[PDB]
Amino acid sequence: MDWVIPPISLPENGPFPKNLVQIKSNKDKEGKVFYSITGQGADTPPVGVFIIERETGWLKVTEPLDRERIATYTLFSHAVSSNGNAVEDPMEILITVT
Amino acid sequence: MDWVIPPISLPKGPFPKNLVQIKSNKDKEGKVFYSITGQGADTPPVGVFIIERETGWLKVTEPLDRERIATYTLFSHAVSSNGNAVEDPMEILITVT
Amino acid sequence: CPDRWMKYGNHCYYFSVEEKDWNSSLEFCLARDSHLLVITDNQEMSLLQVFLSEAFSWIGLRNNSGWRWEDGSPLNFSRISSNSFVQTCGAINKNGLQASSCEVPLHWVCKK
Amino acid sequence: CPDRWMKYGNHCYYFSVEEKDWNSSLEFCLARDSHLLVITDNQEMSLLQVFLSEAFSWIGLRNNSGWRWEDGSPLNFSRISSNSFVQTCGAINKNGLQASSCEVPLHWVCKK
């Protein structure tokens, strides 16, 4: 377990994409790591509300949230190396809308 | 996947207080036993939520104004007599509102 | 409005006095020339909520490629919370919208 | 109060300009004859939030078999939210307390 997850609280507004926090795995100290996210808000409805920069780990919200209607988003972050092999188990990330 | 989870809404007086009855439809094939794990369940704060093992009645045991967790992440488990799981654990999120 | 139904505006509403799963609730409303509750806006939601308790009631809302009403329309107002991903049917109580497993027997509301 | 610290009552607070991880924030405050913020009550938390932004600041709070301040006292007021189970250090912003991975560089608050 080498996931480093900063505190995520949704903003209050743009322009979009809007950066939330930068997620990372300390495994990046041993090799290049690539990031992805799955879950509601990511790859399941509502789709694409959140996206993550594959190389930087920057998690972003893509639209004003008044456009969506769910209370919380349960995302899962993934970390793999060039070959696609996972360097961490997926980490659950709960984002609550206020 | 045969978990049946009713809508939970947090409520002081008659404790423990029933919230909802959960179940796995695997119970129509054999006797199922339920348990919950998680912060608020088997780890601090311990026992805020409990579940009736044979029936699936999930209950809260104290006013939550005494706790400091915004959202509880619990997992329900269903096993058979032989103690083997008949379902994968189900995550149950409960937000204090 | 028919006996035992509540009139609000140009519509009639039936608040059940027993529980059925989501599918059986939908069927009950259809048998009465009505539809499992499709809320149009916040004013209607707020009004109907005054007749509800903390107990949940089924409405014509489901998670089908996003939360959408049975008339095909996607949820465009309010907010819905869920405890578990298997909760794919929508319900309402006096405090708001929440998801529930469709097999759960709950009260329900019809609208004509 | 030393230069750049804010005085309130008989207390001196340091609101950082840059960011450090949790252990580094703790070390810094101790090097300046103070302590990474242990909020005493809801009154002091309310006082503090007036001076905070949406950005989070580290305080002397950690989850070790439950949330407790560095003085060993359990958190007994307010509420803390979290995104992930690995976030075992506490931070605060203008809206409340939130957990964060301890390795994350954040602004911090010292009190003396």
UniProtKB/Swiss-Prot annotation, chain B:
Quaternary structure note: Homodimer; disulfide-linked. Component of an E-cadherin/ catenin adhesion complex composed of at least E-cadherin/CDH1, beta-catenin/CTNNB1 or gamma-catenin/JUP, and potentially alpha-catenin/CTNNA1; the complex is located to adherens junctions. Found in a complex composed of CDH1, RAP1A and PKP3; PKP3 acts as a scaffold protein within the complex, the complex is required for CDH1 localization to mature desmosome cell junctions. Interacts with the TRPV4 and CTNNB1 complex. Interacts with CTNND1.
Consequence recorded when altering W3D: Protein is partially unfolded, no longer binds L.monocytogenes InlA
Provenance organism: Homo sapiens
Compartmental location: Cell junction, Adherens junction; Cell membrane; Endosome; Golgi apparatus, trans-Golgi network
Domain of life: Eukaryota
Induction: Induced in the hours following cyclic mechanical strain in keratinocytes. Expression is repressed by MACROD1.
Domain Cadherin: start-end pairs: 2-97
Name the record gives this protein: Cadherin-1
Domain-related comment: Three calcium ions are usually bound at the interface of each cadherin domain and strengthen the connections, imparting a strong curvature to the full-length ectodomain.
Expression sites by tissue: Expressed in granuloma macrophages (at protein level). Expressed in the skin (at protein level). Expressed in the liver.
Stated role: Cadherins are calcium-dependent cell adhesion proteins. They preferentially interact with themselves in a homophilic manner in connecting cells; cadherins may thus contribute to the sorting of heterogeneous cell types. CDH1 is involved in mechanisms regulating cell-cell adhesions, mobility and proliferation of epithelial cells. Promotes organization of radial actin fiber structure and cellular response to contractile forces, via its interaction with AMOTL2 which facilitates anchoring of radial actin fibers to CDH1 junction complexes at the cell membrane. E-Cad/CTF2 promotes non-amyloidogenic degradation of Abeta precursors. Has a strong inhibitory effect on APP C99 and C83 production.
Effect in UniProt of substituting T37P: In a diffuse gastric cancer sample
Annotated disease: Diffuse gastric and lobular breast cancer syndrome: A cancer predisposition syndrome with increased susceptibility to diffuse gastric cancer. Diffuse gastric cancer is a malignant disease characterized by poorly differentiated infiltrating lesions resulting in thickening of the stomach. Malignant tumors start in the stomach, can spread to the esophagus or the small intestine, and can extend through the stomach wall to nearby lymph nodes and organs. It also can metastasize to other parts of the body.
Curated annotation (Swiss-Prot), chains C, D:
Entry GO CC: intracellular membrane-bounded organelle; membrane; plasma membrane
Domain of life from the UniProt record: Eukaryota
Disulfide bridge map: C1-C12, C29-C110, C89-C102
Keywords carried by this UniProt record: Cell membrane, Disulfide bond, Glycoprotein, Immunity, Innate immunity, Lectin, Membrane, Receptor, Signal-anchor, Transmembrane, Transmembrane helix
Keyword Signal tagged: no
Positions bearing carbohydrate: N23, N63, N76
Extracellular topological domain residue ranges: 1-112
Membrane topology: Single-pass type II membrane protein
Main location: membrane
GO molecular function: carbohydrate binding; signaling receptor activity
Subcellular location: Cell membrane
Entry annotated with the keyword 4Fe-4S: no
Tissue: Expressed specifically on natural killer (NK) cells and T-cells, mainly CD8 T-cells.
Domain C-type lectin: 8-111
Any one of the GO BP annotations: innate immune response
Domain notes: Contains 1 copy of a cytoplasmic motif that is referred to as the immunoreceptor tyrosine-based inhibitor motif (ITIM). This motif is involved in modulation of cellular responses. Upon phosphorylation of ITIM motif KLRG1 associates with the two phosphatases PTPN11 and INPP5D.
Entry function: Plays an inhibitory role on natural killer (NK) cells and T-cell functions upon binding to their non-MHC ligands. May mediate missing self recognition by binding to a highly conserved site on classical cadherins, enabling it to monitor expression of E-cadherin/CDH1, N-cadherin/CDH2 and R-cadherin/CDH4 on target cells.
Name listed for the protein in its UniProt record: Killer cell lectin-like receptor subfamily G member 1
Gene symbol of the encoding locus: KLRG1
Residues of the full protein shown: 75 to 186 of 195
